Design an enzyme around this catalytic site. Structure first.
Site, PDB file in Angstrom:
ATOM      1  N   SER A 178      65.998  44.239 -26.573  1.00  0.00           N
ATOM      2  CA  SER A 178      67.362  44.739 -26.756  1.00  0.00           C
ATOM      3  C   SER A 178      68.130  43.942 -27.827  1.00  0.00           C
ATOM      4  O   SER A 178      68.757  44.524 -28.712  1.00  0.00           O
ATOM      5  CB  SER A 178      68.129  44.678 -25.426  1.00  0.00           C
ATOM      6  OG  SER A 178      68.281  45.969 -24.857  1.00  0.00           O
TER       7      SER A 178
ATOM      8  N   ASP B 253      56.070  42.416 -31.731  1.00  0.00           N
ATOM      9  CA  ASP B 253      56.189  42.321 -30.294  1.00  0.00           C
ATOM     10  C   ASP B 253      54.868  42.680 -29.639  1.00  0.00           C
ATOM     11  O   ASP B 253      54.075  43.424 -30.208  1.00  0.00           O
ATOM     12  CB  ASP B 253      57.265  43.253 -29.794  1.00  0.00           C
ATOM     13  CG  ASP B 253      57.905  42.742 -28.541  1.00  0.00           C
ATOM     14  OD1 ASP B 253      57.611  41.585 -28.156  1.00  0.00           O
ATOM     15  OD2 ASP B 253      58.702  43.490 -27.938  1.00  0.00           O
TER      16      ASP B 253
ATOM     17  N   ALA C 202      66.871  32.023 -28.690  1.00  0.00           N
ATOM     18  CA  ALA C 202      66.182  32.330 -27.420  1.00  0.00           C
ATOM     19  C   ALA C 202      66.169  31.123 -26.503  1.00  0.00           C
ATOM     20  O   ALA C 202      67.123  30.899 -25.755  1.00  0.00           O
ATOM     21  CB  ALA C 202      64.744  32.798 -27.685  1.00  0.00           C
ATOM     22  N   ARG C 203      65.172  30.261 -26.659  1.00  0.00           N
ATOM     23  CA  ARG C 203      65.137  29.041 -25.869  1.00  0.00           C
ATOM     24  C   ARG C 203      64.613  27.885 -26.680  1.00  0.00           C
ATOM     25  O   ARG C 203      63.596  28.027 -27.339  1.00  0.00           O
ATOM     26  CB  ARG C 203      64.257  29.235 -24.631  1.00  0.00           C
ATOM     27  CG  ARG C 203      65.048  29.476 -23.357  1.00  0.00           C
ATOM     28  CD  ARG C 203      64.143  29.747 -22.168  1.00  0.00           C
ATOM     29  NE  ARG C 203      63.388  28.560 -21.772  1.00  0.00           N
ATOM     30  CZ  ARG C 203      63.784  27.696 -20.843  1.00  0.00           C
ATOM     31  NH1 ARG C 203      64.928  27.886 -20.193  1.00  0.00           N
ATOM     32  NH2 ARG C 203      63.034  26.639 -20.561  1.00  0.00           N
TER      33      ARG C 203
ATOM     34  N   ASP D  40      70.836  27.882 -32.065  1.00  0.00           N
ATOM     35  CA  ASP D  40      71.865  27.931 -31.016  1.00  0.00           C
ATOM     36  C   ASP D  40      71.491  27.127 -29.760  1.00  0.00           C
ATOM     37  O   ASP D  40      72.338  26.800 -28.920  1.00  0.00           O
ATOM     38  CB  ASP D  40      72.135  29.382 -30.620  1.00  0.00           C
ATOM     39  CG  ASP D  40      73.371  29.529 -29.781  1.00  0.00           C
ATOM     40  OD1 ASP D  40      74.346  28.806 -30.048  1.00  0.00           O
ATOM     41  OD2 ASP D  40      73.367  30.330 -28.828  1.00  0.00           O
TER      42      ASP D  40
ATOM     43  N   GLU E 156      68.981  20.296 -24.534  1.00  0.00           N
ATOM     44  CA  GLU E 156      70.424  20.400 -24.711  1.00  0.00           C
ATOM     45  C   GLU E 156      71.136  20.049 -23.422  1.00  0.00           C
ATOM     46  O   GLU E 156      70.549  20.142 -22.352  1.00  0.00           O
ATOM     47  CB  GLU E 156      70.814  21.804 -25.149  1.00  0.00           C
ATOM     48  CG  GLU E 156      70.059  22.888 -24.454  1.00  0.00           C
ATOM     49  CD  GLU E 156      70.619  24.254 -24.751  1.00  0.00           C
ATOM     50  OE1 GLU E 156      71.636  24.630 -24.142  1.00  0.00           O
ATOM     51  OE2 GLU E 156      70.013  24.978 -25.554  1.00  0.00           O
TER      52      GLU E 156
ATOM     53  N   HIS F  94      75.261  26.267 -28.205  1.00  0.00           N
ATOM     54  CA  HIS F  94      74.860  27.367 -27.346  1.00  0.00           C
ATOM     55  C   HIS F  94      75.989  28.348 -27.036  1.00  0.00           C
ATOM     56  O   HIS F  94      76.500  28.392 -25.917  1.00  0.00           O
ATOM     57  CB  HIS F  94      74.280  26.823 -26.045  1.00  0.00           C
ATOM     58  CG  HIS F  94      73.325  27.764 -25.383  1.00  0.00           C
ATOM     59  ND1 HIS F  94      72.288  27.330 -24.587  1.00  0.00           N
ATOM     60  CD2 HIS F  94      73.166  29.103 -25.512  1.00  0.00           C
ATOM     61  CE1 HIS F  94      71.520  28.355 -24.272  1.00  0.00           C
ATOM     62  NE2 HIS F  94      72.030  29.442 -24.823  1.00  0.00           N
ATOM     63  N   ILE F  95      76.350  29.175 -28.006  1.00  0.00           N
ATOM     64  CA  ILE F  95      77.444  30.100 -27.787  1.00  0.00           C
ATOM     65  C   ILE F  95      77.007  31.510 -28.118  1.00  0.00           C
ATOM     66  O   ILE F  95      77.830  32.431 -28.245  1.00  0.00           O
ATOM     67  CB  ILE F  95      78.783  29.661 -28.546  1.00  0.00           C
ATOM     68  CG1 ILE F  95      78.546  29.322 -30.009  1.00  0.00           C
ATOM     69  CG2 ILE F  95      79.412  28.375 -27.886  1.00  0.00           C
ATOM     70  CD1 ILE F  95      79.730  28.518 -30.583  1.00  0.00           C
TER      71      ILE F  95
ATOM     72  N   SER G  69      76.323  33.727 -26.008  1.00  0.00           N
ATOM     73  CA  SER G  69      77.017  34.700 -25.178  1.00  0.00           C
ATOM     74  C   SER G  69      78.471  34.264 -24.954  1.00  0.00           C
ATOM     75  O   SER G  69      79.062  34.605 -23.938  1.00  0.00           O
ATOM     76  CB  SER G  69      76.276  34.881 -23.834  1.00  0.00           C
ATOM     77  OG  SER G  69      76.604  33.860 -22.899  1.00  0.00           O
TER      78      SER G  69
END
Lengths: 320, 320
Positions: free
Chosen positions: B156, B176, B238-239, B263, B268, B286-287, B289
């Site tokens: 998404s 993917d 992502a991570r 991000d 972290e 980390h922003i 969201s």
């Protein structure tokens, strides 16, 4: 091999064409060319390639060696050159007015996104090592999608901004004294407004891409701010003198405006001291066209000009 | 009114709904909630609204008072909750996993843009008052138009990103595991790569939107990096454990990678010390969201789960 003085170091692809066509005297920038250095050096060279940083006022044009009958300016503007003076003396001037549209549009998008998303304050929190880890209320901004962007000035750059802005699902409304083609408004689903006051009204995001005019100088001020929706966010990549600093700094503090993303300032580089500590600002040192593709188009263009003087044809971007 | 503990201050709208339906103990971030305090306060309330900062693993689920059979995490993941120990003890657990797709896609596009355009360096030049004025080689980056973007993970978020990138005229190539439907690909003129390698090879810009998984963990390392074009730019929203920090700090310093916009970080907020000083990085706390629209969807969803528990119905986002 004709000789040319290049006042500043340009991108390598520019410098390399220059050196494959001319005997170049390339000046560095550490201690940039002083006009007197230019006036001096001008005597051994056939042609000048200058930046907007060399202010050739009437006084200086009159001081220039009669050797030189060619000045190419590495710039879109010629506010730094007396074109009358050059014309009377039969000094032909040309400029480099292309290659900066997308680059500037990108930066206008960047400033809108970075302002909605508080990128400046983010960067600081990390660099300054003051990040305590993720919390639900930490540096929370707002999304761009289905927010309204009012673009004042809908030419090449305002239109390329709309392209990049419809990819974030923004709603694009505009005002320009030149209403674009229907074929065109359709391209962006851009809503035309026949008044600036009509546009400020709907503008949660406001982009100044306007032409500076004595009448539009400082127009963005208190009275214009109070017509914007509350907590509106304004970006400026056009002309620093379209904005009245005192009134912008005051509303950012009052929160009448949520954020400001400015690429250009009145008095640059000695920008109003209020900007420096305002946390709700995202601010660039005029890097609108600071992309290598842009900076080389400008240079190949400023080289084309010289080429055509020495080739005995009309300058491609003939100013004088 | 059933009482709930909310561990962190949540957005204003969510806090308001909470105190409409519930008697709320709201804990401040001032001196954040400690586990013991949470355990002690769980005795006095009927359910817990916690964040990903409260690590509720077995040894903590053990301590939980018998009155708490409801737990909602303001969070998309649940790595911090022992869902088993919860099932075993009959504690019902839900999360808030929607309303972050666009917000995160925006942050991924901002890092691609602010990286190409060296936005962190601009902000630093202004704020430090190190700006000498415009010059042809000041902070020059690159345009995004007709550059290729490689997206690792076309979910998404990956596709809200391709949307936002095709507005800047990028060419989206992707990998993917399950190739996307014929209609997605046309939406974005994306080009499928049957391997990550054949993707890495074309990727001047590279976006990690992969899931964190045993096989993907620490996948981004020296051998992957060398597979990219010279001076490619890499962003990761992502991570943090998808990226081998040592080998990115090295390649950025070599110039083997031009820029990184990140991000999220391994460890972290205790990120690798060698990031702080790197000038070719654009870095956020980390922003991904951190838009008020997302943050509030999230707390309404987290409140949903508690409404369902006290209603006798299943939580809408039932984890356990």
């Amino acid at each position: 091999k004709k000789k040319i003085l290049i006042t500043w170091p340009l991108p390598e692809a520019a410098m390399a064409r220059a050196r494959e066509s001319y005997d170049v005297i390339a000046h560095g920038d550490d201690p940039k060319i002083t006009i007197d250095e230019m006036i001096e050096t001008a005597k051994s060279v056939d042609a000048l390639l200058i930046t907007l940083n060399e202010k050739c006022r009437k006084e200086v044009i009159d001081r220039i060696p009669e050797n030189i009958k060619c000045i190419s300016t590495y710039s879109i503007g010629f506010d730094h050159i007396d074109l009358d003076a050059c014309k009377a003396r039969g000094i032909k001037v040309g400029n480099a007015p292309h290659g900066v549209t997308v680059a500037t549009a990108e930066i206008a998008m960047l400033l809108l996104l970075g302002s909605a998303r508080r990128a400046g304050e983010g960067e600081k929190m990390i660099r300054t090592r003051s990040w305590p880890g993720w919390e639900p209320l930490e540096l929370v901004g707002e999304k761009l999608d289905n927010k309204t962007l009012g673009i004042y000035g809908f030419g090449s750059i305002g239109q390329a901004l709309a392209k990049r802005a419809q990819g974030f699902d923004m709603d694009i409304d505009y005002f320009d004294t030149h209403r674009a083609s229907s074929s065109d408004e359709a391209s962006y689903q851009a809503t035309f407004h026949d008044s600036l006051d009509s546009l400020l009204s709907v503008s949660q995001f406001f982009s100044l891409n306007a032409p500076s005019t004595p009448e539009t100088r400082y127009f963005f001020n208190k009275a214009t701010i109070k017509s914007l929706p509350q907590g509106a966010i304004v970006v400026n990549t056009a002309r620093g003198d379209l904005v009245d600093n005192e009134l912008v700094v005051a509303a950012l503090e009052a929160g009448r405006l949520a954020y400001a993303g400015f690429d250009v300032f009145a008095g640059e580089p000695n920008i109003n001291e209020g900007y420096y500590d305002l946390p709700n600002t995202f601010l660039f040192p005029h890097i609108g066209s600071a992309a290598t593709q842009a900076r080389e188009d400008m240079a190949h263009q400023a080289n084309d000009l010289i080429d055509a003087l020495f080739g005995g044809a009309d300058m491609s971007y003939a100013l004088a």
